[PDB]
C-alpha cells in the first residue's frame, strides 16, 4: 500500500511527480491524504468527483499482438496462437501458457505448435482471459462465452497499467482518498507511465475547488 | 602540535634548472605539494630595502616549518617553500634540512631560510 501527502499549495513546501514502483501482475492500493490542502478550505470536505488519466512516456510497443474469440456456452473453443506473433527474423517459437495467469473458468490444452483448445466450465456465461507467452513476449487472449441466445459485448483489452472502474473511496471526515492501481501481466519492465489525478473539493454553498497532481509509475521487475 | 597551529598556506616546490641560450641559467620552480602548515622563527632578519634578506652564512636556518608527513615524497636538497598571504608580500623559503619529528612519521620539520619577501616574486607554475 502506497501513501502520499500532497502539497497544500501555500507557496511553501528530482522530478516533478512522485515515484510509484510496480511489478508486472500486481494489483496494489494507493492512499492520498488531501488533509493539508482541503482542511483550511473549510466546507463540506471532499466529493467523489475524482478523475484519472494514464499517459505513457516510454512504451516499447508490444511485440506480440492480442486477439479475441467467441463461443457458445458448454461448447469447446479452438484457436491458433501463431498468427499473433509476426517475427522479424527467422527463429523457433516456444509457446507457453503461464500457469499464474491461466484461465479462471476453464482449462486450455496447449498443443505443440501454436494450437490450443479451450473447454469452458460447465454452465458458465461471461468473459474469460488467459495470458500466453511467445518467446517471452506476453499477450492476452480474451474469450467470451455466450449464453447461447445472441451474444455478449466485446471487452476493452485491458491496458498495461490501469485503474479499475469503481473501487475508489474518499473519506470526507479525514480527507483521505483511496483507489486501486493494477498493472497488467503484459507490462514490460523499464517502461514509465504517468497518472494524473484531478480531485474536486466543495465549499459550504456548492462551488468547486479543483486540485491536480501527478505520479510517475515505473514498472520494474522484482518489485 | 595541535592541528590549529597550522595556519599558513604553503606550496612545496622542487626546482629545475636549464641553461639560457644567451649564456645565463634559469630555475623553474613547480609546485608538488600544497597544504596547511605552521611556521616559527628561530632567528632575526636583515631586510635590505628590496625584500632580500641579508643573511651571511646562508646555511643557518631562520624559520622552522611543520607539515604533515608523507612517506613517498623525498624532500630534496633542491626544494622550495612558497608561502602566500592575503595583504602581505609572498615569501620564498629555501629548505636546508628536514626532521622526521620523533620518527613517528606524522609531521615533517623543515629547517628553511627566508630568501626574499616582496610583491615582485615569481609564483610557482
Amino acid at each position: 500500500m502506497y501513501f502520499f501527502s500532497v502539497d497544500p499549495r501555500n507557496g511553501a513546501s528530482s522530478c516533478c511527480c512522485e515515484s510509484i514502483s510496480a511489478r508486472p501482475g500486481e494489483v496494489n492500493g494507493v492512499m492520498v491524504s488531501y488533509a493539508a490542502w482541503s482542511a483550511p478550505l473549510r466546507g463540506h470536505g471532499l466529493t467523489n468527483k475524482t478523475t484519472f488519466e494514464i499517459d505513457g512516456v516510454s512504451v516499447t510497443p508490444p511485440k506480440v499482438s492480442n486477439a479475441f474469440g467467441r463461443t457458445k456456452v458448454g461448447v469447446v473453443f479452438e484457436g491458433t496462437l501463431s498468427d499473433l506473433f509476426p517475427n522479424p527474423e527467422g527463429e523457433q517459437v516456444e509457446y507457453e501458457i503461464s500457469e499464474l495467469n491461466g484461465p479462471s473458468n476453464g482449462v486450455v490444452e496447449l498443443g505443440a505448435n501454436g494450437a490450443f483448445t479451450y473447454t469452458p466450465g460447465a454452465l458458465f456465461t461471461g468473459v474469460d482471459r488467459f495470458w500466453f507467452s511467445i518467446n517471452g513476449n506476453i499477450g492476452e487472449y480474451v474469450i467470451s462465452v455466450d449464453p447461447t441466445t445472441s451474444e455478449l459485448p466485446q471487452p476493452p483489452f485491458t491496458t498495461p497499467v490501469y485503474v479499475p472502474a469503481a473501487r475508489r473511496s474518499v473519506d470526507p471526515r479525514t480527507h483521505v482518498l483511496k483507489f486501486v492501481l493494477g498493472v497488467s501481466p503484459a507490462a514490460i519492465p523499464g517502461d514509465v507511465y504517468r497518472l494524473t489525478v484531478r480531485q474536486v473539493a466543495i465549499d459550504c454553498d456548492g462551488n468547486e475547488f479543483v486540485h491536480i497532481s501527478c505520479y510517475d509509475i515505473s514498472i520494474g521487475s522484482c518489485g | 602540535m595541535r592541528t590549529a597551529d597550522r595556519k599558513h598556506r604553503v606550496i612545496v616546490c622542487s626546482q629545475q634548472s636549464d641553461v639560457d641560450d644567451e649564456g645565463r641559467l634559469l630555475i623553474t620552480r613547480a609546485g608538488v605539494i600544497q597544504g596547511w602548515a605552521a611556521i616559527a622563527p628561530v632567528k632575526a632578519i636583515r631586510f635590505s630595502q628590496d625584500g632580500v634578506s641579508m643573511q651571511k652564512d646562508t646555511m643557518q636556518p631562520t624559520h622552522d616549518i611543520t607539515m604533515n608527513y608523507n612517506p613517498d615524497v623525498n624532500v630534496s636538497v633542491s626544494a622550495w617553500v612558497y608561502e602566500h598571504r592575503l595583504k602581505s608580500p609572498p615569501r620564498w623559503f629555501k629548505v636546508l634540512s628536514v626532521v622526521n619529528v620523533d620518527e613517528c612519521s606524522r609531521y615533517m620539520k623543515i629547517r628553511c631560510r627566508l630568501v626574499e619577501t616582496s610583491d615582485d616574486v615569481t609564483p610557482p607554475v
Binding site: S5, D7, P8, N10, G11, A12, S13, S33, A35, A36, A39, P40, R42, R173, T174 | R2, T3, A4, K7, H8, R9, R85, L86, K87, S88
Partner: protein, 195 residues
C-alpha cells in the same frame, strides 16, 4: 550583507595568517546564525507545512503545537468529535493555545461493530517559517564574532573543558562544559537581549 567577511576576519585576527578558507568561514557564519538568534528567541527555516493530529491535553484543552506556526496564520483543527473545522489564530513566540471548550458540533456514531465506534482523532494543519527578516542588533554581533573566532582555532581534537559544578561530576571524569559560545563568551553577551 549583514556581517562582512572582512569584518569577521579582522575581528578573529585571520588577516595575512589565513586559517581555513572563505568556504568554511561562510559555513561557520551560517551556523553562528543558527546558534545566535535561535538561543535568544528568534527563528528561521522558511516556509514549511505540517499536518499533525492534535491530542486533547487538559480539561479546558491546552493544545501544544509541535512546530510553532509563524506568528498569526490560522491553524485549522478538524475531526475528533468536531463535525465542522475551525480556525485558531496563535500567539507569536509560543505554541501553547486553548481548544475553545464551547464545542461547535459532535458528529458521533453511537453503535457500530465494524470499528466499535471509538473515534477518529483530532487533526490539524499549519505552516512554519518566515519569508525573510534576518536581524542582528548591534551589540549582539560580538557573540557571533567570538563564536567564529573560537571555532576557527577549536576544530575538535583539542581538549577544552571548563567546570560548571565545583565538587566533581560523578566519576573520574574531567568536569565538563565543552559547548562553545559559552567558553567563547557569546552566551553572556546574548543574555542581555534575553528575557
Amino acid at each position: 550583507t549583514l556581517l562582512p567577511l572582512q569584518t569577521i576576519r579582522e575581528h578573529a585576527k585571520c588577516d595575512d595568517n589565513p586559517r581555513v578558507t572563505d568556504d568554511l568561514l561562510k559555513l561557520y557564519r551560517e551556523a553562528a546564525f543558527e546558534a545566535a538568534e535561535l538561543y535568544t528567541g528568534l527563528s528561521f527555516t522558511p516556509e514549511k507545512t505540517i499536518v499533525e493530529p492534535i491530542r486533547l491535553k487538559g480539561r479546558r484543552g491546552k493544545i501544544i503545537l509541535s512546530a510553532t506556526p509563524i506568528a498569526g496564520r490560522p491553524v485549522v483543527f478538524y475531526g475528533g468529535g468536531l463535525g465542522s473545522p475551525l480556525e485558531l489564530i496563535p500567539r507569536p513566540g509560543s505554541n501553547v493555545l486553548f481548544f475553545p471548550y464551547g464545542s461547535p458540533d459532535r458528529f458521533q456514531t453511537w453503535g457500530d461493530c465494524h470499528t466499535c465506534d471509538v473515534e477518529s482523532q483530532l487533526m490539524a494543519t499549519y505552516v512554519t517559517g518566515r519569508r525573510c527578516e534576518n536581524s542582528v542588533p548591534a551589540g549582539i554581533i560580538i557573540g557571533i564574532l567570538k563564536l567564529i573566532a573560537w571555532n576557527i582555532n577549536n576544530p575538535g581534537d583539542e581538549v577544552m573543558s571548563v567546570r560548571n559544578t565545583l565538587n566533581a561530576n560523578a566519576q573520574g571524569l574531567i568536569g565538563g562544559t565543552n559547548n562553545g559560545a559559552v567558553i567563547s563568551g557569546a552566551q553572556d553577551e546574548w543574555f542581555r537581549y534575553r528575557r
